[PDB]
Write a protein that binds this DNA or RNA. Structure first.
Length: 963
RNA sequence: AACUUUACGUUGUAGCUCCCUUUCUCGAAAGAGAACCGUUGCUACAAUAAGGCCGUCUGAAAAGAUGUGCCGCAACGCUCUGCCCCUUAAAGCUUUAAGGGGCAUCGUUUA
DNA sequence: TAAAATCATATGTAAAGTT
DNA sequence: ATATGATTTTA
């Protein structure tokens, strides 16, 4: 078994890992295995919405439609019973036969006349169906609702129906809303008033069925809709005292040597003041700039304290959170003796599931769950690791908004950098080479420092700015004791002045403690200088937490890192030094060590760089930090000229072992660093011979655990999902392969127009439309926003055109909407593969074929449609079944191709595969589109572990069912 | 992360309706009448994943009534189930048995 | 040709609230 | 990203 350190680089859609041996004193000595794990991040890629959004909106809509349908069913039953309809009015399907299709006009007429049973029924069903809007600043629909309400009772109109007809047919031509207008909505209260008024009139005129029974049934149906909805409710004495106290007890003051909570007398002074006084934070230190506290319940009742008690306060808190109305709240309060809500919350060898109560971001939950997968795979394979080193990406834990904000920020800063480099080139025309980062930064610091050597105030000649050994960008506070590479820690000073500083802060160097003249001049310099406030603050740090600062800069206090260190240190058997065995690297320090150790990247081409930073942070042990700190300290105050401790004049960074970058880059990429267009060593034989080959002096790089990197991917072998696309097209013409869809005029372009159904039936319409689209250079949304009519054979305009039909090609459907419509398909959960006569046959299995349980009986032939497709019987040998991201290999004479199954072409009978790391030196983004299967020799799906180990073929027996 | 409703949109079928291709009759032609389609606009009813169910009342079952009726595009996991893989051990490739893991058509959220 | 590789185009949406 | 009509290239 091994003593090893497992490094992890965690992303939103990838987890890279590596294992590095340690010697007894925890130096890096050897590298074993390394891997990547990719999946799909837990959100919709392009719109940032949740993954369950589609499912919940589907649920909401399903329930809405079934509840409305059921409402109408109950209304028909009620009609039949209270005596309006006999059994001759209804037909076989329980649908009232012979309905008047003229309900609005009947409503208006219905307040002057005795109506026969059928039209009374029609209006009643009409009101139940479209039942208006209920209560449950700005407006869009609410504006239209309120406008019609105002018109209806702050005007001369009788009633909503009548009003609607005249007003909406006088200046719109259409009663109902269309295409996202909301002005013709109605308040349910106004529909209710219209209903009662109609009942009065039908009572008056002698309508037979205007009974109390029908009135209650109909009215209740119209108005009734479901009302919106031992753990601790928060607005309770027990909960607010706790939120006050437990969040108070971790407030720390930076003391002389350590941090300290407030003294028992200090905490006592203001424990009871949020009780005794209404308010605070800025006045927390005024007694002992955000809020940080307010006692909501106690002070709400006050606004001389109040005289209540906990048992009563606990009961009123519970009663107000479980109930909303006056009704039940008074009940429990009445026995016991304002608005409340928002209830309160209340070692092995492997890692237990990530607590979804503790972790409530889906992206982070998925990333950490695959992190746990990788961790347990590594453990079961190699035994318990000594240390777990974690480096989690910057975008982990952030909202979609925040991620986008940062994406924006980095584009504008890249534009800025190009502009600044242009200025620098203009300043330095004869500059041999191109601007590097430190040169541009030297220019910025010159401008920022006012062209003054911030340590001496000497004017800096710009001509010599980029002279080797004239100006140097400095670590104001030194790097040995603080590990600060940050931009606020850098000031541009001459080389003449920065040679006797040592590793001293300016306050220990300019004798700031005796407030000497040099310190006064210096503080003035940086104060007036163009640096931000943060920079000025850190340049003049007087005394600080040496150990605190270094720990701060090596450790990430992000929530996910905090929790992850805590959860992997508490609930996991780690063979490490008991003090602190999990480590969350700082982003900038990991970046520094990668860039200084030779793995400065190739900027996202293939999917294996995650292993790079996993390796870089695996190696950040305390012994390595020792070595780096000694080296940096030395170089800080020279001492690199003939001397010795316990010192050659050209010593660069203490890398873990000699030839770190070479070995690591070979193993991770199979090619030597600097040469990414080599011949990849995709075998053990090539990789091991290349490691014994290229690396002469390192025979410790060839052992029995050297395996090439094969990225593992998320297996999504679900058999549920979307049934069909939500655009329903007519199937009347599906005999010949077409289907007609009403395309609205505002969004039909030339290509859509050419397929217009009546192109040979209104050459004047076709011609006007073609003419107009060509006239406006077809941008239809603007080109048809001017009402366009239908001119006669020899005459004036007659009829508006608001949408026109278009026939589109179709050879597949999904018969939806009661076999009345055909829709497109969307999800191919599976592809069953058969082999007869050394030929390979593909059988797509979709997700409606699963809902019905259809096991398809037909394979795919190119060009021929489903009715002329090869049938599959008992003569076909079963091979395997492919789901998305199933590792498959296909061998033919041309090539051998090995990857993850991604697509199956329905038309062409081909399948597409992704490469393991989606590389662009192969295919289209590493997706291999269009692969032969019928003419090939070998076709078999394999296995994959999360690590990449244990890749072995598959043979299946009995063909599985679809349900 | 759940939950109520609304208003559209799409498909189907009706009544009216703006255009119009062919086919039958009347006419010398000019024009008319019609039919089956296609389809512009308006209104209404049915459906609004594909698929599966419940409960209450008369009933002897038949079978009829009835409901603020219900689930179905996700995350995670291994208590149960299915597949696949890995070990381990015994006998003549399977069997038995024990164990472990990956993923789901399995389980919880969830009705 | 038949199969394999390539290219190319279409995917439902606003509102109002509640816990 | 998926699904799939339509088109070109190849044994």
């Amino acid at each position: 078994s091994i003593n090893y350190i497992l490094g992890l680089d965690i992303g939103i859609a990838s987890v890279g890992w590596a294992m590095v041996e340690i010697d007894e004193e925890e130096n890096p000595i050897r590298l074993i295995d390394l891997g990547v794990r990719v999946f799909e991040r837990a959100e919709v890629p392009k719109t940032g919405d949740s993954l369950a959004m589609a499912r919940r909106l589907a649920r909401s809509v399903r329930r809405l439609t079934r509840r409305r349908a059921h409402r109408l069913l109950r209304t028909r039953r009620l009609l039949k019973r209270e005596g309006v309809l006999q059994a001759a009015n209804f037909d076989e399907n329980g649908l009232i036969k012979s309905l008047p299709n003229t309900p609005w006009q009947l409503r208006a007429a219905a307040l002057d006349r005795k109506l026969t049973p059928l039209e009374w029924s029609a209006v009643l069903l009409h009101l139940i169906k479209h039942r208006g809007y209920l209560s449950q600043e700005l407006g869009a629909l609410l504006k239209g609702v309120a406008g019609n309400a105002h018109a209806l009772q702050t005007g001369d109109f009788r009633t909503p129906a009548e009003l609607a007809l005249n007003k909406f047919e006088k200046e719109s031509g259409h009663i109902r809303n269309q295409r996202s207008d909301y002005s013709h909505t109605f308040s349910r209260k106004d529909l209710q008033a219209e209903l009662i008024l109609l009942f009065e009139k039908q009572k008056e005129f002698g309508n037979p069925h205007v009974s109390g029974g029908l009135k209650e049934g109909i009215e209740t149906l119209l108005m009734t809709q479901r009302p919106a909805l031992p753990k601790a409710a928060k607005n309770t004495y027990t909960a607010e005292r706790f939120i006050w106290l437990t969040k108070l007890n971790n407030l720390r003051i930076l003391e002389q040597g350590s941090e300290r909570p407030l003294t028992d007398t200090e905490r006592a002074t203001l424990m009871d003041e949020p009780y005794r006084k209404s308010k605070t934070y800025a006045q927390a230190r005024k007694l002992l700039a955000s809020t940080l506290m307010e006692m909501k319940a106690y002070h709400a009742i006050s606004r001389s304290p109040l005289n209540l008690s906990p048992e009563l306060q606990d009961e009123i808190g519970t009663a107000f959170s479980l109930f909303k109305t006056d009704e039940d709240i008074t009940g429990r309060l009445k026995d016991r003796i304002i608005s409340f809500d928002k209830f309160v919350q209340i070692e092995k060898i492997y890692l237990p599931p990530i607590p979804a109560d503790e972790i409530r971001n889906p992206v982070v939950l998925r990333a950490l769950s695959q992190a746990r997968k990788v961790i347990n795979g590594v453990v079961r394979r190699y035994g318990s690791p000594a240390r777990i080193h974690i480096e989690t990406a910057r975008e982990v834990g952030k909202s979609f908004k925040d991620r986008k904000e940062i994406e924006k920020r980095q584009e504008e800063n890249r534009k800025d950098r190009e502009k600044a480099a242009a200025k620098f080139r203009e300043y330095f025309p004869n500059f041999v080479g191109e601007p590097k980062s430190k040169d541009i930064l030297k220019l910025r610091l010159y401008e920022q420092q006012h062209g003054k050597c911030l340590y001496s105030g000497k004017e800096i000649n710009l001509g010599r700015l980029n002279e080797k050994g004239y100006v140097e960008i400095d670590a104001a506070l030194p790097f040995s004791r603080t590990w600060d590479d940050s931009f606020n820690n850098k000031v541009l000073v001459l080389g003449s002045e920065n040679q006797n500083k040592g590793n001293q802060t300016p306050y220990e160097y300019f004798n700031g403690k005796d407030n000497s003249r040099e310190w006064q001049e210096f503080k003035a310099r940086v104060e007036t200088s163009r640096f931000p406030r943060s920079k000025k603050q850190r340049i003049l740090l007087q005394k600080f937490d040496e150990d605190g600062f270094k720990e701060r800069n090596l450790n990430d206090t992000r929530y996910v890192n905090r929790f992850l260190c805590q959860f992997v240190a508490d609930r996991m058997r780690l063979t490490g030094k008991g003090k602190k065995r999990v480590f969350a690297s700082n982003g900038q320090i990991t970046n520094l060590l990668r860039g200084f150790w030779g793995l400065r990247k190739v900027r996202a081409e293939n999917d294996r760089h995650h292993a790079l930073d996993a390796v870089v942070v695996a190696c950040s042990t305390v012994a390595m930090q020792q070595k780096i700190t000694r080296f940096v300290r030395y170089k800080e105050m020279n001492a690199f000229d003939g001397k010795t401790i316990d010192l050659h004049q050209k010593t660069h960074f203490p890398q873990p072992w000699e030839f770190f970058a070479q070995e690591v880059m070979i193993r991770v990429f199979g090619k030597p660093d600097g040469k990414p267009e080599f011949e990849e060593a995709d075998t053990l034989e090539k990789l091991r011979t290349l490691l014994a080959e290229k690396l002469s002096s390192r025979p410790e790089a060839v052992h029995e655990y050297v395996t090439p990197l094969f990225v593992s991917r998320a297996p999504n072998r679900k058999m549920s999902g979307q049934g069909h696309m939500e655009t329903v097209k007519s199937a009347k013409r599906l005999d010949e392969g077409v289907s007609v869809l009403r395309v609205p005029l505002t969004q039909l372009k030339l290509k859509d127009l050419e397929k217009m159904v009546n192109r040979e039936r209104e050459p004047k319409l076709y011609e006007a439309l073609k003419a107009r689209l060509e006239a406006h250079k077809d941008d239809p949304a603007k080109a048809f926003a001017e009402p366009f009519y239908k001119y006669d054979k020899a005459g004036n305009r007659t009829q508006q055109v608001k949408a026109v039909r278009v026939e589109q090609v179709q050879k597949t459907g999904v018969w939806v909407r009661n076999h009345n419509g055909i829709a497109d398909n969307a999800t191919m959960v599976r592809v069953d593969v058969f082999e007869k006569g050394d030929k390979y046959y593909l059988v797509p299995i979709y997700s409606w074929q699963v809902a019905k349980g259809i096991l398809p009986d037909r394979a795919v032939v190119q060009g021929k449609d489903e009715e002329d497709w090869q049938l599959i019987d008992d003569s076909f040998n079963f091979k395997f079944s492919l789901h998305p991201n199933d590792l498959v290999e296909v061998i033919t004479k041309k090539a051998r191709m090995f990857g993850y199954f991604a697509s199956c072409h329905r038309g062409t009978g081909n399948i597409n595969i992704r490469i393991h790391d989606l590389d662009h030196k192969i295919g289209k983004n590493g997706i291999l589109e269009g692969i032969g299967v019928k003419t090939a020799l070998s076709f078999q799906k394999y296995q994959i572990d999360e690590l990449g180990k244990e890749i072995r073929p598959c043979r299946l027996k009995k063909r599985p069912p679809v349900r």
